[PDB]
Design a protein around this ligand. Structure first.
Ligand SMILES: CC(C)CN(C[C@@H](O)[C@H](Cc1ccccc1)NC(=O)O[C@H]1CO[C@H]2OCC[C@H]21)S(=O)(=O)c1ccc(C(N)=O)cc1
Lengths: 99, 99
C-alpha cells in the first residue's frame, strides 16, 4: 500500500501468534514492542529516545507479519508507550518514503 | 525524492535562517528540534516519548524548508536527542510511506 501521513501510520502485525497494532516509524532504528510474551531466549539492552532511556529484552530472529508481509529480525521488548516498527523491519517489507 | 530506509532518513532543513539536519520521522506527530534560537512568542508544553517526557517550547506558524520544500507549522524546541520532522510537516511536503 501507499500510506499518507494525515493520521498515524498504524498497521496490524502478527507476532508470537498474537495480533497487535504498531506504528510504522521511520525515526526508529529498531523495532520496540510493549511488554508481551515471546518464545525465545533474550539479551538485556538499553535504548534511548526522547525523554531518556528504557531497559528492553532483545530477541533476535523473531518472525513478524506486518500487514501480511513477513519479516524476520530483532525485536526489542519493553516499556515503550507505543508499539513501533523500526527501520530494521521496514527495509524487509520494502517500505520507502516518497515526496 | 524517493528515500529507502537502510540508513536513517536525514535531510537538511533551513529554519530560522539556520541550516540543520533532521530525521524524517513518521512515528512523530509533531516536529521537535534541539535547542536553537527561534524568532518569536512561544508556549510551554510537555511531550512524551520512549523514556518519558521532555519540556519544550511550542512555536506556531514557523517556516521550515525541508529538502527545498517549504512548510509552515508548529515546531517544538527542547532537549530532544535528535532533530525530528513529524507528520505535522511531512503532510505539507507531500511525504508518503510506500510498500
Ligand atoms: C526520537 C526518535 C529518534 C526515536 N524514537 C522513534 C520515534 O518515532 C518516536 C516513536 C514513539 C515513541 C513514544 C510514543 C509514541 C511514538 N516518536 C516520538 O518520540 O515522537 C514524539 C514527538 O512526537 C510525538 O508523537 C509521538 C510521541 C511524540 S524512539 O525513541 O521511540 C526509539 C529509540 C531508539 C530505538 C532503537 N534503539 O532502536 C527505537 C525507537
Amino acid at each position: 500500500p501507499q500510506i499518507t501521513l494525515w493520521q498515524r501510520p498504524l498497521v496490524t502485525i502478527k507476532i508470537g501468534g498474537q495480533l497487535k497494532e504498531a506504528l510504522l516509524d521511520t525515526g526508529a532504528d529498531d523495532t520496540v514492542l510493549e511488554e508481551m510474551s515471546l518464545p525465545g531466549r533474550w539479551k538485556p539492552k538499553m535504548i534511548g529516545g526522547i525523554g531518556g532511556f528504557i531497559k528492553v529484552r532483545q530477541y533476535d530472529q523473531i518472525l513478524i507479519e506486518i500487514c501480511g508481509h513477513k519479516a524476520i529480525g530483532t525485536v526489542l521488548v519493553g516499556p515503550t508507550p507505543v508499539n513501533i516498527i523500526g527501520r530494521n523491519l521496514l527495509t524487509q517489507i520494502g517500505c520507502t518514503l516518497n515526496f
